[PDB]
Design a protein around this nucleic acid. Sequence first.
DNA 1: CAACTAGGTCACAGGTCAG
DNA 2: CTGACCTAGTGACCTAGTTG
Lengths: 78, 84
Amino acid sequence: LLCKVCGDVASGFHYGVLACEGCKGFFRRSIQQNIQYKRCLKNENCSIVRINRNRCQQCRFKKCLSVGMSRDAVRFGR
Amino acid sequence: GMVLLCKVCGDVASGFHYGVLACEGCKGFFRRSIQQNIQYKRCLKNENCSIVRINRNRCQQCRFKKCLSVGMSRDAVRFGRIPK
DNA sequence: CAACTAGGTCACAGGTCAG
DNA sequence: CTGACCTAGTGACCTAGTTG
Ligand SMILES: [Zn+2]
Ligand SMILES: [Zn+2]
Ligand SMILES: [Zn+2]
Ligand SMILES: [Zn+2]
């Protein structure tokens, strides 16, 4: 499976999407606090892949919130 | 390893930056180099300089060319704990 | 109870600012 | 400019916990 967010290999089904450890952790970290990720530099249309997933935080998150990641979409068990 | 040396200048490496084991100077140098319209003067020797700790700041152009020469890329960064 | 994941833990690019 | 010291994260791993 492929992280449905940065094409990096997926560790499991996370927050309602197949994802890699980095985007899972990066997701919980984004919702599990009231952080104000700095505005976007490159006009809010940032690509997100395994090689540049950490460059824009607003865009990696916004992307997370588009492939349908969410806790109300969490799914425990086989 | 206990002590790995900077692949750009042989200084002690403070980690694995931009894709390779670099000292802390090249690290901040590479970053500063790619992070701007920073174009260094040419190299009075047609870029054949060598890099070591003592002369690593003499010819910039050649150091940067050394960084890129070894692999330093924003696309080669390995964040978080070293795997196994 | 096993298959399977949300969270915590903690091993690991960039801003500073003195030299 | 340069780079030793901070700050703010990043994600490999472990396992407490949840389903079916
Ligand atoms: Zn990912
Ligand atoms: Zn962006
Ligand atoms: Zn170095
Ligand atoms: Zn030179």
